[PDB]
Design a protein around this nucleic acid. Structure first.
Ligand SMILES: [Zn+2]
Ligand SMILES: [Zn+2]
Ligand SMILES: [Zn+2]
Ligand SMILES: [Zn+2]
Length: 111
DNA sequence: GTCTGCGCCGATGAGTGC
DNA sequence: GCACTCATCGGCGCAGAC
């Protein structure tokens, strides 16, 4: 219902449209109090601020290695679980990493 | 040159709750 | 209806192994 006048993407609420418009204005209201870097999204600032705390809180349940971000831990744990979420669209092969799947698909296309 | 592992982002989605 | 938090996932970059 809330459409963007500059790119035709559509949004559900005034708040999501206001946030999207920062993609076009470059507005970055949320500033890190340590290094001064600014962010368009408050949650991205909060994630960034974890870098300055030096607390690697997210610990791998298989090898105990610690990571600053939960998302970084989760990608790491795929090595242990065998999760291969990147599927070749042309054959049975499945891949841990998108880059590897992408290069494999390109080899199909070249043939 | 490719695969791997991982550190840090943008910008949208899901869930929650008013 | 609405905003807020945190997740999501591709992008980018880089170093090491081969
Ligand atoms: Zn737009
Ligand atoms: Zn900072
Ligand atoms: Zn691990
Ligand atoms: Zn394939």
């Amino acid at each position: 219902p809330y459409a963007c006048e500059l790119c035709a993407k559509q949004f559900q609420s005034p708040s999501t449209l206001k946030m999207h418009m920062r993609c076009h204005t470059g507005e970055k209201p949320y500033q890190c109090k340590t290094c001064g870097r600014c962010f368009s999204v408050q949650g991205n600032l909060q994630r960034h601020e974890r870098i300055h705390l030096g607390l690697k809180e997210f610990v791998c349940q298989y090898c105990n290695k610690a990571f600053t971000l939960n998302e970084t831990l989760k990608i790491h744990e795929r090595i242990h679980t065998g999760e291969k979420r990147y599927h070749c669209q042309f054959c049975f092969q499945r891949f841990l990493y998108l880059s590897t799947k992408r290069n494999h698909e390109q080899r199909h296309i070249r043939e």
